[PDB]
């Protein structure tokens, strides 16, 4: 479960 950025957005799994 991949998070991105300062808002920690949901982006992809694995």
């Amino acid at each position, epitope marked *: 479960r*991949i*998070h*991105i*950025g*300062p*808002g*920690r957005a*949901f*982006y*992809t799994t694995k």
Partner: antibody
Amino acid sequence: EVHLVESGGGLVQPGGSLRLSCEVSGLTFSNSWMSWVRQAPGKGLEWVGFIKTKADGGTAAYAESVKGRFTISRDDSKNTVFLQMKSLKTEDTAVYYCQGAVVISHEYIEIWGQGALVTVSS
Amino acid sequence: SVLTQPPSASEAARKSVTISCSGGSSNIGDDSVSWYQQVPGTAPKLLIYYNDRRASGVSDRFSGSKSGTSASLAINGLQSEDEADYYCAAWDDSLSAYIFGSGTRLTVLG
């Protein structure tokens, strides 16, 4: 096309309280991960905290240096995220920026506001 | 536990620069690096996210890579617009906070 417009900046004495607003247009606010980063005069960048979408927790988390003095909250009705500050120190004097972020069609997008200056001083 | 960048960098117009960032396994190691550009006065702008993906509407002169516990932003066809501060950024696991690099002031010669 996207814009993040913040406000409520100003001057407030040590010990005081203050509320920043960030108003987001050109974005589905519902699905936007909102956060705040600050930059103290002549220094580097420091993350303040974020708030999740309603479809997740709706919950916020915070940098330890503001934990419990700062509250992030949001109003999906009014397309706006808030950064409530209480118990301010001089060390809190900075330009505060919010960020909006979505993920549409496997692509990430993160837009920043122009920032608002908060001066803590007597 | 901090992300460290060289303070300054420099190169001539039309050429290419590399800016590095080194963290530890708890931030860059475990997650992914993003890069920001900041021209003094203005706000920062996202350039790269998830190690190597380009932000919506950004010159392909910019590109990013991640090797192990370090990370690297590269810039081609160097224009004068391009001098700014550059910040890497990652989530850190032990601190539980989004952490930004020291920052690097690129200057363009010639």
